[PDB]
Amino acid sequence: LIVNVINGPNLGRLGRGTTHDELVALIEREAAELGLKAVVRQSDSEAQLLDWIHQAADAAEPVILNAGGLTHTSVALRDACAELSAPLIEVHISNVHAREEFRRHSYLSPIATGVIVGLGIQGYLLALRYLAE
Amino acid sequence: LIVNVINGPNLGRLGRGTTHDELVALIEREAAELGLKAVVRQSDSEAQLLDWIHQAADAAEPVILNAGGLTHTSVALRDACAELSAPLIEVHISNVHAREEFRRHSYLSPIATGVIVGLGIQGYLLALRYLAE
Amino acid sequence: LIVNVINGPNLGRLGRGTTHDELVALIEREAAELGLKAVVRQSDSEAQLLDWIHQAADAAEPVILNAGGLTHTSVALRDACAELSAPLIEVHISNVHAREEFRRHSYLSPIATGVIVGLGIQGYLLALRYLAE
Amino acid sequence: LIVNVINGPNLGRLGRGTTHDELVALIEREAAELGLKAVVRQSDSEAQLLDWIHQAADAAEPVILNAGGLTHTSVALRDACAELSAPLIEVHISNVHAREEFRRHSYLSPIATGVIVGLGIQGYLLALRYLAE
Amino acid sequence: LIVNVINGPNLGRLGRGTTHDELVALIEREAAELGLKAVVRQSDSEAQLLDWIHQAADAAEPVILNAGGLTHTSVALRDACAELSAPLIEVHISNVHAREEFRRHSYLSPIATGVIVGLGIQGYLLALRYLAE
Amino acid sequence: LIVNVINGPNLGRLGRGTTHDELVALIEREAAELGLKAVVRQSDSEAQLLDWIHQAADAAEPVILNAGGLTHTSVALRDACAELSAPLIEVHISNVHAREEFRRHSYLSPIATGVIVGLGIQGYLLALRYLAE
Amino acid sequence: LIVNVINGPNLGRLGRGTTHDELVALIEREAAELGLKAVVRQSDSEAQLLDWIHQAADAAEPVILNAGGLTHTSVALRDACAELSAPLIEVHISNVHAREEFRRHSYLSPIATGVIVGLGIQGYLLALRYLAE
Amino acid sequence: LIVNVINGPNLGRLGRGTTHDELVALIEREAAELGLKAVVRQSDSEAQLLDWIHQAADAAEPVILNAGGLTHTSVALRDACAELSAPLIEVHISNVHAREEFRRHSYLSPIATGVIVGLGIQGYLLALRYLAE
Amino acid sequence: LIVNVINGPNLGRLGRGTTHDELVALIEREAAELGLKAVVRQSDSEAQLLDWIHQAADAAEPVILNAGGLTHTSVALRDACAELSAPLIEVHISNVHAREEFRRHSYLSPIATGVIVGLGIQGYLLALRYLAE
Amino acid sequence: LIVNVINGPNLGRLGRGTTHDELVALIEREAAELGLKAVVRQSDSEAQLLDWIHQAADAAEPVILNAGGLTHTSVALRDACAELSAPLIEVHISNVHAREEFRRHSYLSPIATGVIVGLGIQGYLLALRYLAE
Amino acid sequence: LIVNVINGPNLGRLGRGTTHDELVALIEREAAELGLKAVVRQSDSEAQLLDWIHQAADAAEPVILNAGGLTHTSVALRDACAELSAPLIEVHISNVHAREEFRRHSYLSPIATGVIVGLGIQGYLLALRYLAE
Amino acid sequence: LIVNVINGPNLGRLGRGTTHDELVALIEREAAELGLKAVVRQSDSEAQLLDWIHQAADAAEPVILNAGGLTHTSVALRDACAELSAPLIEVHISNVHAREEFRRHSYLSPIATGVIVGLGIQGYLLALRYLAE
């Protein structure tokens, strides 16, 4: 049973400790243990992100999404996620409520199933464990 | 190794499905599996909550906190949690970003290690699994 | 048939003309005439107020509530009242719209059946007469 | 002893259960019982409303006012009511704090003796009973 | 099949090119072609406007409305239109989003079927063509 | 040479010292001395006010306007005055900046030639003396 | 004579009744009848949208634009449209004033010739009929 | 009987038609006719302005004040004028409500007897004529 | 002659240098020197704080109050202090204007005699010295 | 050991009871008792105030500052005080939180060591006693 | 020694006088004179811009950035620039503070070394001259 | 050919590295090289600054202005600069967008030719080089 993990702009740069390739490996391993398949994806392109969301909508597949900056700015992304019928878990590696004020609003949260912030890369793994149950 | 799970006002009423006593049992079981001890606590009294936080500060013990309504309103609670040296995970059973606008601000988040909302009672279990690692 | 009349912080001090004990007597008499029983209660403690609301929820009993200052400040109180299935009448002795600006917002009103302000202690009696019909 | 009951724009349409003519009858009956005379009036015209308020000012007669939409919008109406020396009870059939945000501000409340919202057509009768005492 | 075209304050003054009488003629002709009857009406009086809306509510007839200034200011007008069961098309000759900031909010839009701004007098004709289909 | 003096809602009530009839006489006398004719007018009706403004537009006659409450609320009135080609002097008997905050904004001022507030009934006479020169 | 119809992010998904391909056909047919050619285009890519706008600027060709989410968010898109010398009609299938508050602001409207919202796919056809005349 | 006319920063530059020296002459002449003495003064220095206000306070002499930019910015100036026991007329040559938004707030107005804006240099003469009566 | 020193939530934790017990001793000593008696008190309970304020009201005794977080949040506390007839000095150990923005508003200040912030524990002693004179 | 006491605009006018000269004497006496020298200074000139602050910066001398109106308005003054290495005590004779809303913000507080408001002229003496210890 | 000059959306259109190709030539020449190499780049694609920023981060190369509309809207772009270790000069050809209000906020400025606006294409050359020294 | 360089409050204190006298020398040298004369000036006095601006207006000479704190606060200064016919370059040594929020608004920018912030003392030299071309 399949889960999509979609990362947005600047998440390629993870480890400006952990690199993005490692994150894929961690997630892929954790997903194996839980009896899931993780499809992990990254793009700085909104249009590319939207296409992945569209497909997940069509497939009725759940999504773990970390949209980077677009979280606070993209109504379009929000609208594609609003179409998903399966669960959507919004994920942030950092605690967004501990930095600038503008980071404390999210267009995705209201239409998300739930949200995890500030638990680093393990937020992704916790999100997997939710969708497993 | 010990973890405090502190629930605030109105969380006694859980199951206006799951009752609070069951939640304690779920958490206590999940904590056992992870090789932790969970001390779970509930109070409609802010002063009582603050005392539990004080003690966790003194003990250097981590806290999973779901402060109910006081999340959006209590600076005092925020200040007691700010004193905790161990991790603090803020937890909400509901997605607060999907209801009233006033629910989308939290005095605790900025001083928390991280935050989980909208994953129901499993948010508590995911928070345990974080502190385990 | 029973009605709960719950007063919050500072309402013990009524008559810094009429004292709170007199208010209880007025209400108890007026309730008798209407063929009701009034249970009147006062506390400066939010937790104590919440317990009385919880019980009224459980009992399916209606509530006339004057929460004093907590009206403008307590999300927790709002959430306990939101659980009441019977009518909730919000009451204020003073006209709150005639004093400071901060007094002109109420967390309770939106989840209340209705609201009476500025008719003094008779607001309580008018509220009784509503619930009678 | 006389009481004016003034309804504003759209209150002719009551019962898009109860019709406005019935409301007049209810009020007229309830006023009889209390040993008052009710003069009930309705207009979609602000100028017409203002004239009725002017007269009540001049007569020193009290007013129960439900100004419909003009409550949230008319400074002029507010200024005519500010001139009334007798009591002014502001009335709303609906709970205005339960609908749109713009409905939660009133130019009349601060200059009113008091306010009743969300108790339906009985709000008018409760207001009568106040002015009786 | 009948359509009401209601213009509010200051629309008598059209052509401080086209006069209001001409507008009636254009609309009446265009409506003929579409196999409708247009009843066109203008008033600087809110109460008069409300009466026309009431009637359209009662008749279950659709309305094309250009309320002039009252668009940004009248809650009462909004409430009468909210009662209409047939379509309501909000029309503005000018682009309101190109002038003052206060012109960019409308109490009618949220309760309207749809809105046309900045297409001049042809906005009325386009609105007719909608209701035809 | 002619000047229109237009008063809005509640200005009939002047002298809840000076009555409105006296004001007309003062203005008419002062206008005589200056070699003008004053046409003074009062209405609680916005539509009636707008008609007087329309006519002054058409006549190219100047206007001294005290719109009462409608100053802070009417976009429609603003739009009729915006059409006047001759001078428009906005007048207020009271100092509006000394009372409520909502009184300190005016839709008319930006489109007026100028404004006089807080000089009582003499504001009208000063406005006449301007238009004389 | 040519008209560009440009749709933005998520409009490929139309018919999560009508599909986007059908919309192209409707528009192409309606344009034929009016003696126009419609060039219809869709992209989730802002840069791709901007290129189409640039070209329309250069060609001096008019544009009917439905930018989806980017309407409320893109200053860049606004700036490309500001360069168009021919008419620009802003189109929205839904009534944006009936959903979230953030949907009620548009960077495009002020620089657009005019705007149509809430008339579904026929908004595009009405926009064509404008540009025909 | 004496009147102080105090101009603030940038009013030396009048006539970047009329020069400031001419303004003094106009005022001095008009004051003569009214049987007053005008003391006219100008300074770009706030401290210098405050000293003139202090003196007028002490003397119990009235003041016509045009504080230029300091109107919208100086609490200190406001506080010196608040001490004046005689009338204070606030004057602006331009209509401040017709330019930038920041120009539409004044710290002086609330503590002024009254205000004249947009009647050019004659505003000063009208203000004299007030204080004469 | 007696002075009440009331500390609110989290002030038990002073010295997460100086402990609260030491603070009591400092104050008690300083009060002795000034020929006063200091009654010092601390509670994390709002209701408990309110009771101490009530008593001081009744006794007509002055109060030095440091309400911790409740300063920025409690209308109820504000209302109890508003009843005190003797002086009320509001005290804060830290400079509240140097931390978060939310700390820079206080419900108590407007109804306090005066306020001391940022002078550490000596703020209490300075407040004593005021009430001595 | 030296302390600077700097008063700003309008503080010359103290005693529109106590005069400024008396205040200097009180402070000079109290400073003597504490084994300090007080240099007290007053100016309506910001530039003059800034020079005194500059000098105190250079001297590394502490400052007790009551800037009058400039407190709420001067960023420049704030920047000179930010340079002081010794303590800065901000002083206000009145309770600023009890008057207008604009008086409740201060550019100085965040960069001050601490603040005293509403304790009249004794605020200066209390501030001296701080710097003594 | 290398400098990156990155232009965002709509800057291809420069010269709707100077064309973008000319700008490249000007910059390339000016950079030669200063003993630098300029790499100039333009894209309407955010993802493409981000890639260029990433590379400059990795290379530790400085950047002169004119992000067009994305300046006021992109948090993602801000986050990529925040990673640059070398200087970042933000450039705008126009004075953004002289047009719409929304243009007067920039997500880039706070994380930029510095900013140049309103000096036209020479802003780029001035920025080069900075990085030279 | 002459350029005025005007610095405001607190810029005398430069080098609480570089002193103001050095800055004058740098500018004077750089201006020589460019075939200009620099007249550099500094004052903590607004009135003194305004006089220098007036003169530059009269002379039709350009100005490089760094008004310190007055940038964010002085409407008067803004109005004197608005009169300058030659270019006005606004200069800030620091990046104002990287410190407090209040520093991110400027009354001068909208009426300036352009703005340079965060490039230290070289901002002045870059501004010279602009005016040279």
Ligand SMILES: O=C(O)[C@]1(O)C=C([C@@H](O)Cc2ccccc2)[C@@H](O)[C@H](O)C1
């Ligand atoms: O913490 C996150 O995962 C977040 O989603 C990511 C970004 C990225 O643009 C920046 C970032 C990139 C990698 C790790 C942490 C932060 C930030 O823009 C978001 O505000 C928060």
Ligand SMILES: O=C(O)[C@]1(O)C=C([C@@H](O)Cc2ccccc2)[C@@H](O)[C@H](O)C1
């Ligand atoms: O979702 C939560 O866990 C939350 O912390 C709890 C409350 C409680 O007051 C209401 C509540 C109580 C039990 C389950 C869900 C919600 C709400 O006040 C908070 O806004 C959100």
Ligand SMILES: O=C(O)[C@]1(O)C=C([C@@H](O)Cc2ccccc2)[C@@H](O)[C@H](O)C1
């Ligand atoms: O008028 C009320 O009944 C109200 O609920 C009560 C309080 C009390 O805290 C103060 C109070 C207490 C007793 C009578 C009137 C007012 C105020 O805090 C509320 O704003 C209004």
Ligand SMILES: O=C(O)[C@]1(O)C=C([C@@H](O)Cc2ccccc2)[C@@H](O)[C@H](O)C1
């Ligand atoms: O609830 C009320 O009585 C109220 O005064 C009336 C209106 C009317 O315009 C609409 C209305 C009309 C009749 C019954 C309920 C509501 C609303 O505009 C007001 O917001 C509330």
Ligand SMILES: O=C(O)[C@]1(O)C=C([C@@H](O)Cc2ccccc2)[C@@H](O)[C@H](O)C1
């Ligand atoms: O453009 C409209 O049709 C509008 O509804 C009309 C008015 C009128 O008051 C002014 C007006 C009147 C006639 C044509 C254009 C504008 C304006 O008040 C509205 O803001 C816009």
Ligand SMILES: O=C(O)[C@]1(O)C=C([C@@H](O)Cc2ccccc2)[C@@H](O)[C@H](O)C1
């Ligand atoms: O002072 C004015 O002339 C003013 O225009 C008039 C009204 C009137 O509604 C109330 C009024 C009526 C008569 C004299 C003073 C005030 C107020 O509504 C306006 O705010 C001010």
Ligand SMILES: O=C(O)[C@]1(O)C=C([C@@H](O)Cc2ccccc2)[C@@H](O)[C@H](O)C1
């Ligand atoms: O109603 C529109 O056409 C609108 O432009 C489109 C979107 C799309 O993102 C969502 C959408 C897509 C298809 C049909 C209706 C709405 C929304 O983002 C806009 O707010 C409104």
Ligand SMILES: O=C(O)[C@]1(O)C=C([C@@H](O)Cc2ccccc2)[C@@H](O)[C@H](O)C1
């Ligand atoms: O119109 C006024 O008299 C006003 O008081 C003066 C200024 C002066 O700074 C600018 C000015 C100077 C001379 C004539 C008109 C305007 C402006 O700053 C104020 O906003 C308005």
Ligand SMILES: O=C(O)[C@]1(O)C=C([C@@H](O)Cc2ccccc2)[C@@H](O)[C@H](O)C1
């Ligand atoms: O500085 C204070 O004394 C203050 O009243 C106290 C608290 C306490 O909750 C935290 C605190 C506790 C002990 C010393 C300093 C600060 C803060 O909440 C208040 O904002 C400021």
Ligand SMILES: O=C(O)[C@]1(O)C=C([C@@H](O)Cc2ccccc2)[C@@H](O)[C@H](O)C1
């Ligand atoms: O209370 C203060 O000392 C204050 O600093 C002084 C002023 C003075 O401008 C007015 C003033 C002058 C003398 C005593 C009290 C108040 C006010 O402007 C400030 O808001 C408060």
Ligand SMILES: O=C(O)[C@]1(O)C=C([C@@H](O)Cc2ccccc2)[C@@H](O)[C@H](O)C1
């Ligand atoms: O002035 C700039 O260089 C700016 O960065 C550029 C844009 C461009 O989208 C529009 C533009 C394009 C080319 C020259 C001037 C302005 C605007 O969006 C920005 O607000 C300002």
Ligand SMILES: O=C(O)[C@]1(O)C=C([C@@H](O)Cc2ccccc2)[C@@H](O)[C@H](O)C1
């Ligand atoms: O950075 C600037 O040049 C600025 O104009 C100057 C000031 C001065 O008051 C403080 C200052 C003085 C000297 C160098 C940097 C900053 C600040 O007030 C402004 O906000 C910024």
